[PDB]
Amino acid sequence: QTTMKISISTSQNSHQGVAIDTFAKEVEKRTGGRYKVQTFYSGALGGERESIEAVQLGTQELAFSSTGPVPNFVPETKILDVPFLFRDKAHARAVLDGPIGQDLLGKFDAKGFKALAWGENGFRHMTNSKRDVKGPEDLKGLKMRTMENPVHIAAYKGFGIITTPMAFPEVFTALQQGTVDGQENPLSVIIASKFDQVQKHLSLTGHVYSPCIWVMNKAVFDKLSAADKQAFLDAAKEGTKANRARVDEDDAKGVADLRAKGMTVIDNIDKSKFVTALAPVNAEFEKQFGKANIEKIRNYK
Ligand SMILES: O=C(O)[C@H](O)[C@H](O)CO
Structure with a gap:
């Protein structure tokens, strides 16, 4: 057996922890024990x-991550981080599971990655x-931590926030x-x-949708047999189902x-x-990522 590692920044008892545990279980089952995946949390x-x-x-085979730091690697994903683009989770999921999202995986x-599938962090x-x-x-005037995401940083500066990008474990x-x-x-x-x-203060601003992405080292993925490549793809899809179910439960329980x-x-x-406050900065996002591309996402089914 080959044992691989996957890591996240949140706990085992979270939407992302149940995702990677499900993924790890499914990889071992579907590859008949040829591959096992050690999980690392927090x-x-x-x-x-x-x-x-x-x-x-x-140096590591796998990660499950929000898109926060992803534009630093793959700039085409920025359009997903635009505020108030997605009406709700059903809209976002449909977009990411359909050709728009599937093309972005490519x-x-x-x-230098194989992106196995999209998952979900949730509305922020x-x-x-x-x-x-x-x-x-x-x-x-509020000093707020942000992820290392240039769309988020520009947006929040638009609200007059004093932004401080930080890795999650420092928050x-x-x-x-x-x-x-x-x-x-x-x-x-x-x-x-x-x-x-x-x-002590929380407001349900829902100001951006935060996808997660399953990423695997490309060379590691490419050396898998054809059948095992498919096992890893299918295990990620199962991980996403568990992930999204947990997000729905957490959003339902969360306020109480x-x-x-x-x-x-x-x-x-x-x-x-x-x-309304974001209108000037949003105009720039539309000009950078393309109004045609924004509207295609907006109008998707
Ligand atoms: O705030 C963040 O950095 C992310 O939402 C977190 O690491 C989970 O993906």
């Missing part, structure tokens, strides 16, 4: 950028330790020590990382869960106010 093999870099270098080939929401956020003006301590006022993430991540302990953990949660956000 940044044990580094944050997402470090893990993807390792996969590209070949762009990873030239950068603002938290902070200073004040309730009801409109964009409330974001102005709890930064919030704890007040190095930043806040951050933004899906409810799955806020709950699994226990950010309720260090943030966090209220019980002491957060003040603002659950009825008027997103149009935030769209």
Whole structure:
């Protein structure tokens, strides 16, 4: 048997942890034990950028990651990180599972990966330790951690946020020590990382959709037999099913869960106010990634 490694930045008991555990189980079953996959949680093999870099270098075979750091490797994916592009999870999933998403997986080939499938981190929401956020003006002047994503950083600077990019494993301590006022993430991540302990304010801004991607080292993938290549592809699809189911459960439980953990949660956000604030920066995104490409995603089924 060949034993490979896969890593994530969140816990085993999270949407991403159930994803990689399912993937690992399915690889072993479908390859008849020829391959086994050791799982690493909570940044044990580094944050997402470090893990993807390792996969590209070949020091590690696999990673499951949000798209946060992905444009640094594959710039064609940026269009997915545009705020308020996707209406809801059903829209995003349909887009990513259909030809638009499937074509984007192919762009990873030239950068030394096989991208096995798309998965899901979820819609991201603002938290902070200073004040309730009801409109964009409330974001102005907040120091917020961001991922290492240029679309997110430009967008949030558009809200007047003072941005600080950081790898995920450093975020709890930064919030704890007040190095930043806040951050933004899906409810799955806020709950699994226990950010309720260090943030008292949450607003369901849902300001961007955060995909996850399964990446494998291209050379490692290419040396698999044809049948085993298919086993890895199918194991990733099963991992995605588990992943998405967990996101749906976490989004359903999340507001109540966090209220019980002491957060003040603002659950009825008027997103149009935030769209209006972003209009100038959004115009630039549309010009960079192409209005035709944006509208194709918007109008997809
Ligand atoms: O905030 C982040 O960096 C990501 O959402 C997290 O690592 C899970 O993918």
